[PDB]
Design a binder for this molecule. Structure first.
Ligand SMILES: NS(=O)(=O)c1cc2c(s1)S(=O)(=O)N(Cc1cccs1)C[C@@H]2O
Ligand SMILES: [Hg+2]
Ligand SMILES: [Zn+2]
Length: 256
């Protein structure tokens, strides 16, 4: 079924998920000159102090770190949002080379990877109900550039070896997501969708201005993952990103 290869890649998704051609699809190019500064946007409130991570899983398209979302432990509020959004998982999209891998681009600049911390609106009771709503999810996206190593990232990198293939998971408790944030919380925001099937248009996207840098040996580890399951032919998990979709009459507001 879907994936990122020539035969089942982004350009084929519309056949099974017609919403791929919809009106608020993601990712988009952020054009910094056309984004409107909106001084009514409140500051973001990232409360990741009580975060409880549980495990890391290679799901065949990325690896996800799942968090216990049964109580308001790690939440996002403020910014463009109304209400409390709970952290449920985070994952990355990366490239086969350092010049590609982000999903969102800024003035057409692609970064080496992009981190998505996925939150759902607690108003709706569970994640499944939240993906039925136009303001059901908020994903915080952070660009990664290659430079110095990110200390907070290394714990994830050291575990990727035990989850090499599709369907492996490993326990991964006590990871603190705060070590993945940039210094500044300045952002662009716009209404959008999930960037992988089922491509539902449930998401308020918050994309931070400031990228974090990771080393080349750290992103190199990402690239060793496999799309396939154990015993299947090896396909390296690289380039698991969707190209920018048309903005078609949405405006990207900026908090700065
Ligand atoms: N790339 S991205 O940030 O826009 C996201 C992709 C996926 C996300 S967020 S999800 O965890 O919410 N989930 C979506 C759903 C699961 C069940 C019903 S819909 C898995 C998706 O692959
Ligand atoms: Hg929706
Ligand atoms: Zn994503």
């Amino acid at each position: 079924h879907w994936g990122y290869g020539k035969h089942n890649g982004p350009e084929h998704w519309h056949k099974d998920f017609p919403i791929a051609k919809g009106e608020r699809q993601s990712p988009v190019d952020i054009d910094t000159h056309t984004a409107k500064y909106d001084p009514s946007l409140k500051p973001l409130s990232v409360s990741y102090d009580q975060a409880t991570s549980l495990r890391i899983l290679n799901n065949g398209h990325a690896f996800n770190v799942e968090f216990d979302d049964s109580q308001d432990k790690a939440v996002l509020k403020g910014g463009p949002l109304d209400g409390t959004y709970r952290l449920i998982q985070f994952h990355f999209h990366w490239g086969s080379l350092d010049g590609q891998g982000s999903e969102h681009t800024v003035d057409k600049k692609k970064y080496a990877a992009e981190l998505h911390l996925v939150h759902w609106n607690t108003k709706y009771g569970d994640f499944g109900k939240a993906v039925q709503q136009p303001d059901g999810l908020a994903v915080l996206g952070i660009f990664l550039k290659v430079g110095s190593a990110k200390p907070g990232l290394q714990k994830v990198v050291d575990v990727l070896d035990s989850i090499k293939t599709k369907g492996k998971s490993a326990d991964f408790t006590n990871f603190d997501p705060r070590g993945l944030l940039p210094e500044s919380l300045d952002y662009w925001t716009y209404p959008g969708s999930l960037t992988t099937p089922p491509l539902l248009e449930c998401v308020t996207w918050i994309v931070l201005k400031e990228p974090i840098s990771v080393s080349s040996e750290q992103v190199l580890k990402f690239r060793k993952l496999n799309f396939n399951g154990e015993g299947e032919p090896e396909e390296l998990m690289v380039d698991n990103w969707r190209p920018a979709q048309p903005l078609k009459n949405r405006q990207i507001k900026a908090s700065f």
